[PDB]
Write a protein that binds this ligand. Structure first.
Ligand SMILES: Nc1nc2c(ncn2[C@@H]2O[C@H](COP(=O)(O)OP(=O)(O)OP(=O)(O)O)[C@@H](O)[C@H]2O)c(=O)[nH]1
Ligand SMILES: Nc1nc2c(ncn2[C@@H]2O[C@H](COP(=O)(O)OP(=O)(O)OP(=O)(O)O)[C@@H](O)[C@H]2O)c(=O)[nH]1
Ligand SMILES: Nc1nc2c(ncn2[C@@H]2O[C@H](COP(=O)(O)OP(=O)(O)OP(=O)(O)O)[C@@H](O)[C@H]2O)c(=O)[nH]1
Lengths: 427, 168, 438, 438, 168
């Protein structure tokens, strides 16, 4: 049948894949040991898109986890769900990248690529037909960016007929910890632009502000913020997983989304975010759902598109809902701000509803937006790159690995190409 | 005195969880049947179920989803022991008692006892295996269930004469 | 004998086919097992079902439809459904992949390898059928997967058999609502490909369906259940003349011959007058005058075109239930006296009536009313060209910007077909206006 | 009277013969002891068995079949099975050495010391036999040990008895699946050595058997159990004419005379229409029109030859069950009217029809259907030449490099044999195309 | 209660082994027979087998296969005393009590007690040695087996009335 196998890479992927997979497992009601507890016929039937089954009712995940430092994988294995992950999928190098993009792109990749390809093709032969692969990494990751670029380069021709879905968190515009993250991210996106199809953009300042906004609980964990983002990505996944008249396939969505190839950077959206007393202080109705989902602050990816306008929007709805409410909500938003849409296309609105409630909450939703707000983001990155390339800071490592400024010249030429691209289209 | 239906509501909620778990139940059952090799029989005795479960059950569900079926058929006997003594009973309650006593059995004739609307079990059921076999096996539970809820349905109308029949 | 065969393409069409066949088995009193009570109806498959179901000596009916669907989800839902034992196992054709709303992807990439087996189903129905008056197909122009497969299949069956009737039924693209924007493309593609082989195309719209639902049914939260039930009663009304007889019988042959003055244009619209809530019909009364006023009411239409701007060509009124010729002809005479209705001067006669004594039937658990007198008003008018006007006004800008075309060209198509589609459309309007010119 | 001797050569054929007579004992109710229950059947030994089983006053039925295998393994396991008491002790010819797939090894090194014994067996069968119309040979073309021994024994039975018939049945080489590459070599040897003596040759291929199994028998894990079940049902159907009666009985001799237009080419193809799972059987209807459309469906036949590539010459339909010649001739008239099916101009008609009233029988532990009307389809067509075409383009480059030769030249052969066989198959193909051209 | 059936299950797994080693027992029994010279007799009395054991048994297997048959015979012999007590029993249970008590006899007539489907032992029996001898001697074990099993089959059917019949 038709399934999905996942690539987990980078030290963010370390925690992110763990949280995401355990969220899925709890959503499907399996014990931490691994023996499913019979409660959901639909999920038992449809598990075959994500998990293979092992002797013992053990729906083994088809996720390939890769990094270099053994400590992270040791901690993950010691984690509550290390058992769900197999020694087969525990592949790693025995050294450190220094989070250097060039090192992780040419030096240690040169030795790990064979084995990682081996694992992924092992799973590929094991299964019949994929929609493709989705990746969890960050462009803000010194190792994730390089190794992910390597593997996408390896595979986009190997399976030229699939989905290259990617999940990546942009470093905080106010602070990037490392000073060379701009260089690493610039090179990474230079390779990503011609290869990928989908990229979900994430930022952590927005996560902190959401915590201060509705979580309001002072001291959560980065793991809990991963809980939230994993809930979002799980919601976008469940479309295939579950019934209800909505056209689920990620290609169904993408062909409906991307007006022209160069659009690969995307803004998610999510549904009820609830505080300590708002559970009993909330009237759970579709119209206020719509208001919250299209709030000015409910966005969580990059920044307020209030500067710019709207290109495409898709709204998926998880629970017991009807057609008329979402239809009239579309009408009402269209009438509320027809101006804030782009004239080249009306009805940027795309609708999809699954009739299966989430566990814990009855009716909810997810949203994905392609809007004109990433421009200021990569204008930032352009400015820092121009500044740091003006004096050529921190370059002797890259030279010693064997690169040159010529690469950066054409990469930033391409970035300016995308700059003018967006400015022409939405301006 | 009413607690029989208090237990019964949990039992029927389990039956609805089985309503979710019915195609899965037969999905495992057919793999069990292939391995047990006795395909020429209408499945009425749970001895076929035991022959199915003692072996080739290397996948989690293979044990639980079969064993709770024996668990519920034991639980119904636990309830029926309460009905056995209570009061002697009006003739209709008596008849319900004795027929349920008979129908509670290991290898009985509960093979092709298909029922009336709604009883969606055979409706949801697929094909020839379900129309030549898979008769009483899927419907015997609600049959006993309704014929035992009529037992309480006359209990509120049991007069002062019947309030003391076998309790005294 | 008197039998037509139904195709249902698209997971959008699967639930509507399921609902209508459910309704059918209800009024026929078909037990969900597939067998009748002690009363004898079975034989060599010759009774009230022999038009729709096929119940041979085994005593189990065979519905004369095939549901083709690209995705396993809802087709396996119905493969787990209640009446599946009735449903033929591999008459529920299922695929593994999508058309991704892409017309060419659904018409070329995977169609070639499914069309052969579905043709085998068609011919293995054809051998057993004799009368084969034609086909009844549940689809949509904006098939997210059904559209392209339907286009290829329609072409294939048109070329293999060009003597029977082709009856296409679709949702229309909602004029001011769009859940997706590949639909403006695929709609015109289907249209320009189908105009020269399709026989009779009929159309509905969900927005006005809901508008009715809270206008007279007054339902504030209806569902697809009601949507499918109402399209089902529409098709049941059009098939009643085959189900039974009445004062005078008619047929799809007459439907075409009268309904079509001139070729190409075969796009009328149906309407059902006694749409009303149960309590309302409980405390009101029904008769010919009011049902005629209703079927001529300009807003009970489920197409966003205005008769007062259009100009009428055809009207067929199919009455089901109890009537007499006297009062009904009085009503229609009052109509043809009435000056608001503006038919062409071309047609002296523009009316065709078909009578059945049998009243319409209801469904347990339903929400409709106790109709003893119903009528379906199937009418064609010039008012329709506005829809294509709006659609071309939408499409010209999409075509000039050629958005989304990277995918279509990547899967391997070109631009000349997208051109000739719009010149076919422009032909459609240049044929719509001069005919309305009297 | 009516009776024949069956030959069963090859460890490929031993279990299939076992299964065939396992089926055979069912319909006659032969108990695994060798005696029917208390109903009077023992005596002079003249009933339905007298053709196949031999139940004298000793009361034990005795099949008129010969099981020959060159390896002790499977013959000893069946000699430890459940019907060995039925089985005559040494008609289970057990061999102490193997032919190594080598046709010349099994034709020269080992055959001589066992041909005498098998001759003694067959003569001490022929003495007791009276009618002894012919021999039913179950073997394999790529005979690992069924090739050379079969060739030598068929040569000897041909030379000693050229007055009666010989019925050859074997698995055709798998067109695109290779279990051995010595198989083509030994196969072509056998073919060219058999063309001049083989009377009635028929071939089987497992790939499409499996395809049928998961098409309509609906099994994802079938086995030889099912394979041999199908083939044994085929041969039981073909023996039904001798077994029982109907409207008419036709014999292998007429099968030959009509089915062969012209000598050499005696390689027709059998098929069974009501191959179907019991579930479809229960919830579907069976009759002449649909079963005939199925029997002319090009992919219901185990051989990978395209009839629409070829042109039909011969067809023979056998009807097991209750039917009427009315609908029989109606269906065949529809066939003749059909334009897709292209018989050759030479034959005006193409049918040979056979009827027996008794419906087919199911087996305990059986995966087949509850079939009432059955038809066997013995057809011959031009397209089969493609199989030998494929074999020969497999052959040519092998032959060019002379691979594995050391084996055969050392064991004692030379090139002239294979040299001959090539232009032998060339003659086969050229007469194929010559008769294809009119 | 079901402890004896628990013991049987092992007994019939050893019977499954008997399927594996039954013909070898027959061959060793021949090796006994030639030197015993009681060749004009269908074997029915285990006194013949005791007359077999003591001599021409200097090769391990000769004793090893032979002895354990009497061990299982004594096993079921022990099993019968527990059945002897329980309760008086339902008529069918009592009739099975008499049947099992009757069949236990060392010098008995169990020589030609052929059984129905499947009972493959005579099927595997080769030639006329088993068509004039070797009858009930090879399946008298299933004869007690199946009927004592359908004895305990009514145990799940036993009412409160039959619960106390001979236990006190
Ligand atoms: N797992 C994890 N990642 C975090 C956390 N906080 C921030 N991150 C970011 O997630 C990014 C992506 O991780 P990787 O792709 O593995 O990064 P890398 O290639 O190893 O390079 P580094 O930035 O040095 O880690 C890191 O660069 C961090 O900046 C956290 O708490 N846990
Ligand atoms: N005919 C029909 N249409 C529906 C139904 N529900 C919603 N629709 C509308 O019909 C359209 C269905 O088109 P598609 O989504 O392309 O369906 P498809 O081609 O069969 O394949 P998918 O894309 O996988 O669904 C939707 O855009 C809706 O606007 C329904 O039950 N029946
Ligand atoms: N007729 C028949 N063929 C089979 C059967 N099972 C497998 N086959 C095919 O038949 C072929 C067997 O032929 P051989 O290997 O030459 O058998 P053989 O000539 O009797 O002697 P061996 O070399 O010992 O096997 C195999 O290649 C299989 O592909 C079966 O049950 N019956």
């Amino acid at each position: 049948m038709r399934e999905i196998v996942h690539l987990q890479a980078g030290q963010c992927g370390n925690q992110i894949g763990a949280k995401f997979w355990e969220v899925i497992s709890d959503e499907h009601g399996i014990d931490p040991t691994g023996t499913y507890h019979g409660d959901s016929d639909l999920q038992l039937e449809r598990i075959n898109v994500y998990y293979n089954e092992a002797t013992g009712g053990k729906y083994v995940p088809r996720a390939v986890l890769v990094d270099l430092e053994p400590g992270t994988m040791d901690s993950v294995r010691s984690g509550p769900f290390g058992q769900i992950f197999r020694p087969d999928n525990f592949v790693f190098g025995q050294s450190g990248a220094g989070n250097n993009w060039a090192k992780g792109h040419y030096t240690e990749g040169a030795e790990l690529v064979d084995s990682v390809l081996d694992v992924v093709r092992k799973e590929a032969e094991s299964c019949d037909c994929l929609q493709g692969f989705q990746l969890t990494h960050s462009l803000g990751g010194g190792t994730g960016s390089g190794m992910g670029t390597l593997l996408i380069s390896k595979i986009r021709e190997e399976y030229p007929d699939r989905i290259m879905n990617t999940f990546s968190v942009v470093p905080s515009p106010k602070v990037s910890d490392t000073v060379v993250e701009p260089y690493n991210a610039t090179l990474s996106v230079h390779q990503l632009v011609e290869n990928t199809d989908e990229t979900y953009c994430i930022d952590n300042e927005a996560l902190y502000d959401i915590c201060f906004r509705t979580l309001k609980l002072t001291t959560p964990t980065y793991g809990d913020l991963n809980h939230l983002v994993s809930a979002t990505m799980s919601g976008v996944t469940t479309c295939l997983r579950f019934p209800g008249q909505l056209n689920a396939d990620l290609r169904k969505l993408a062909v409906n989304m991307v007006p022209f190839p160069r659009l690969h950077f995307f803004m998610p959206g999510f549904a009820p975010l609830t505080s300590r007393g708002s559970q009993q202080y909330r009237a759970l109705t579709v119209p206020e759902l719509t208001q919250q989902m299209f709030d000015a602050k409910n966005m969580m990816a990059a920044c307020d598109p209030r500067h710019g306008r709207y290109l495409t929007v898709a709204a998926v709805f998880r629970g017991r809902m009807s057609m008329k409410e979402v239809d009239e909500q579309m009408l009402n938003v269209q009438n509320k701000n027809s101006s804030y849409f782009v004239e080249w296309i009306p009805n940027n609105v795309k609708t999809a509803v699954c009739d299966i409630p989430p566990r814990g909450l009855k009716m909810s939703a997810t949203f994905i937006g392609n809007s004109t707000a990433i421009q200021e983001l990569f204008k930032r990155i352009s400015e820092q790159f121009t500044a740091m390339f003006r004096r050529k800071a921190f370059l002797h490592w890259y030279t010693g690995e064997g690169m040159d400024e010529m690469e950066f010249t054409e990469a930033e030429s391409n970035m300016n190409d995308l700059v003018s691209e967006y400015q022409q289209y939405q301006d | 005195m009413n607690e029989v239906k208090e237990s019964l509501r949990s039992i029927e909620q389990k039956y609805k969880l089985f309503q979710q778990q019915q195609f899965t139940f037969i999905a495992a059952l057919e793999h069990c049947r292939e391995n047990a090799h006795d395909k020429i029989r209408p499945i009425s005795s749970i001895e076929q179920v035991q022959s199915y479960m003692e072996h080739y059950c290397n996948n989690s569900t293979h044990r639980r989803i079969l064993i709770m079926f024996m668990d519920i058929c034991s639980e119904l006997s636990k309830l029926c022991q309460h009905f056995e003594a209570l009061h002697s009973g009006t003739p209709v309650t008596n008849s319900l008692l004795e027929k349920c006593k008979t129908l509670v059995s290991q290898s009985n004739d509960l093979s092709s006892l298909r029922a009336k609307y709604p009883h969606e079990v055979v409706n949801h059921l697929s094909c020839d295996e379900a129309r030549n076999h898979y008769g009483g096996v899927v419907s015997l539970i609600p049959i006993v269930l309704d014929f035992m809820k009529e037992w309480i349905a006359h209990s509120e109308k049991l007069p002062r004469k019947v309030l003391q029949h076998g309790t005294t | 004998m008197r039998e037509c065969i139904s195709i249902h393409v698209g997971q959008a069409g699967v639930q509507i086919g399921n609902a209508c066949w459910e309704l059918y088995c209800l009024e026929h009193g078909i037990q969900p097992d597939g067998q009748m009570p002690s009363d004898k109806t079975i034989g060599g498959g010759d009774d009230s079902f022999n038009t729709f179901f096929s119940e041979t000596g085994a005593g189990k009916h065979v519905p004369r439809a095939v549901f083709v669907d690209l995705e396993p989800t809802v087709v396996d839902e119905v493969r787990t459904g209640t009446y599946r034992q009735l449903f033929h196992p591999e008459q529920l054709i299922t695929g593994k992949e999508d058309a991704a709303n892409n017309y060419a992807r659904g018409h070329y990439t995977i169609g070639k390898e499914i069309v052969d087996l579905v043709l085998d189903r068609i011919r293995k129905l054809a051998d057993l059928c004799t009368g084969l008056q034609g086909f009844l197909i549940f689809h949509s122009f904006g098939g997210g997967t059904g559209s392209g497969f339907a286009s290829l299949l329609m072409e294939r069956l048109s070329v293999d058999y060009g003597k029977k009737s082709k009856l296409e039924f679709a949702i229309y693209p909602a004029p001011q609502v769009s859940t997706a924007v590949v639909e403006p493309y695929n709609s015109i593609l289907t249209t320009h490909t189908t105009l020269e082989h399709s026989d009779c195309a009929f159309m509905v719209d969900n927005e006005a369906i809901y508008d009715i639902c809270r206008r007279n049914l007054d339902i504030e939260r209806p569902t697809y259940t009601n949507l499918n039930r109402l399209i089902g009663q529409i098709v049941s009304s059009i098939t009643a003349s085959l189900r039974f007889d009445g004062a005078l019988n008619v047929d799809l042959t007459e439907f075409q011959t009268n309904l079509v003055p001139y070729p190409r244009i075969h796009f009328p619209l149906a309407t059902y007058a006694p749409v009303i809530s149960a309590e309302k019909a409980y405390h009101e009364q029904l008769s010919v005058a009011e049902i005629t006023n209703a079927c001529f009411e300009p807003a009970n239409q489920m197409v966003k075109c205005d008769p007062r701007h259009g100009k009428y060509m055809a009207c067929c009124m199919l009455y089901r239930g109890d009537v007499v010729p006297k009062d009904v002809n009085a009503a229609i005479a009052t109509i043809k006296t009435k000056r608001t209705i503006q038919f062409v001067d071309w047609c002296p006669t523009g009316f065709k009536v078909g009578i059945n004594y049998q009243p319409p039937t209801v469904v347990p658990g339903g929400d409709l009313a106790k109709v003893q007198r119903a009528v379906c008003m199937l009418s064609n008018t010039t008012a329709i060209a506005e829809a294509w006007a709006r659609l071309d006004h939408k499409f010209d800008l999409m075509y000039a910007k050629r958005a989304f075309v990277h995918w279509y060209v990547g899967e391997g198509m070109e631009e000349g077909e997208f051109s000739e589609a719009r010149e076919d459309l422009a032909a459609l309007e240049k044929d719509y206006e001069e005919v309305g010119v009297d």
